[PDB]
Design a protein around this ligand. Sequence first.
Ligand SMILES: *[C@](O)(C(=O)NCc1ccccc1)[C@H](C[C@@H]1CCNC1=O)NC(=O)[C@H](CC(C)C)NC(=O)OCc1ccccc1
Ligand SMILES: *[C@](O)(C(=O)NCc1ccccc1)[C@H](C[C@@H]1CCNC1=O)NC(=O)[C@H](CC(C)C)NC(=O)OCc1ccccc1
Lengths: 299, 297
Amino acid sequence: FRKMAFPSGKVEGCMVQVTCGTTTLNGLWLDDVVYCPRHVICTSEDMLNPNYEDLLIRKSNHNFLVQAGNVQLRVIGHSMQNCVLKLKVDTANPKTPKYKFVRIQPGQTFSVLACYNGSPSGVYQCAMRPNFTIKGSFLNGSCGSVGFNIDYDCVSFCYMHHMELPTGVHAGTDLEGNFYGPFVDRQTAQAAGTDTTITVNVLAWLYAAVINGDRWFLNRFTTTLNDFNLVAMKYNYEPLTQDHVDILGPLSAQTGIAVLDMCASLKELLQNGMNGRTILGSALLEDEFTPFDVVRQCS
Amino acid sequence: RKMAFPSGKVEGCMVQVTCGTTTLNGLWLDDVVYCPRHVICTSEDMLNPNYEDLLIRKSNHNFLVQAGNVQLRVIGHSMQNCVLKLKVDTANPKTPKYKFVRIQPGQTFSVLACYNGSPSGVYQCAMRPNFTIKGSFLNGSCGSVGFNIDYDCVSFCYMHHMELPTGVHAGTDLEGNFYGPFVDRQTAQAAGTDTTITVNVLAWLYAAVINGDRWFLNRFTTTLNDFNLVAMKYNYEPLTQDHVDILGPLSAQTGIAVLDMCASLKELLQNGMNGRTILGSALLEDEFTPFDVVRQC
Ligand SMILES: *[C@](O)(C(=O)NCc1ccccc1)[C@H](C[C@@H]1CCNC1=O)NC(=O)[C@H](CC(C)C)NC(=O)OCc1ccccc1
Ligand SMILES: *[C@](O)(C(=O)NCc1ccccc1)[C@H](C[C@@H]1CCNC1=O)NC(=O)[C@H](CC(C)C)NC(=O)OCc1ccccc1
């Protein structure tokens, strides 16, 4: 199974650059609005503890340089929504796809179009860790790059990039400017909670193994959801939610293996280990393929 | 992380091509649509297709090309090796600057997997030394293409034709010549013995150092030939002096001589990873080139 990203073209058609002074990052141009991280308005001195409301009062439309390539887009209004700046522009993006703004849950995956100076460099598939960081390739200049899923013709934007944490992982907001996790857009030392394994995705991976004929680990038993969750937490696995059980529904129906029976098989793997065997050609359980990802690549 | 090129410039070229009950993808550049020639086969034909004979029996109107909701009229067709070229009466305004290249084993490229002319996903692949690729391709993916992007220029290097029994994939360049000893007939084909792309494993090890990981480093060194003796024993490709040269930038960046990293890789091959992981992986990764690593660090 490959880490497979969504085709990026519908998002490429929405990327622009936004500059204040000498600070340039990326923005997202949808209809007549450009969305970008509010710290574009910061100098280095503001970034230690910015007063964003005061910084913004000192700004006017004519202080923002928005470019699609080398072509300037005139700003006609500005406002701040949580940690994102919204710049109204005088031109509706003709490449605007059908879109939605969604706030994803930890464990969900998405594609990131890594951009520098409004120019796309690469696309890759990311998972939101339970501690609300992502393990990505973001360099200086990548802020404002977005993460997304594509359903039918509709791009669901879920992530906008803002920062790198001391440990090398990345943090950001949804497109309404609300950070994922306990982070703030200040150049201060901040720590992500200890990470955990994404149980629902491991289960999806076991279902994938079954679909492909690799099923030695299926046992004759079952468990309750509460009993599984209490055990799982002792192994630094996330507890399952009702939504997790529901999104495993299609794979459970495809295989005829009840979700809680698979939970009991996983519990045995956690308590006894692999005993030298492999699953899908690996002794490690994979936790960055969602149940949807599994469906995508198998069917 | 494994990064693919942005696929928009290729998405605007994908179309659907149908002949009989066979539908797959084509690549529409200017006024020509390129697709695998086996679109003209039937159940019967597939086992031993005499393509020139099957093709001479086709008319332009036996080919249905669809770009979204619009049918493109075929006004001419020709065959170049395993690729069919359909001339259509309208030019693709979304045609990027492009070239056709034939890549070398060990080089990487992005694949835009498409079904019924519609882009479905994008991922990064390497041309294996045995000229397969480890892709993710289902029924309907034939005609999907692989590419690299340099400046605004798309270099197409791969069109998809086949899944081998082992689950790996085979296909052609855009001149229609297969990579490898494979044939576009409906038969179970085995590849040559695969080997590991050593220059890429070394680039990946350097990448792991850059990201603050070095449990596998050691104080030893090795000559080039002595490393290559061990590499070949473990079905790793030999490392050439041009490979060593190509690795210079990563060596400079990290202060680790190429042959010192070869000594670390030697140790890993002989001992294994002893349960440990490098950049999250239980296995040595060989599908990042030195260029891929440098660009991303
Ligand atoms: C992001 O602001 C960005 O990419 N800005 C454009 C730019 C152009 C030229 C030089 C620098 C930046 C940036 C993205 C970071 C940088 C390295 N990897 C990333 O993901 N984000 C930031 O710099 C944060 C801004 C504050 C206001 C939140 N600060 C931050 O990430 O703090 C830690 C850090 C770690 C390494 C390097 C820089 C900063
Ligand atoms: C490719 O022809 C394709 O996608 N065709 C359109 C299509 C196919 C089937 C149903 C609907 C529409 C196809 C791609 C394969 C299929 C599964 N995964 C892939 O990557 N390619 C082929 O089917 C090959 C055609 C030949 C004529 C080149 N056949 C093939 O891969 O055979 C392998 C094989 C294995 C064992 C025994 C015999 C053959």
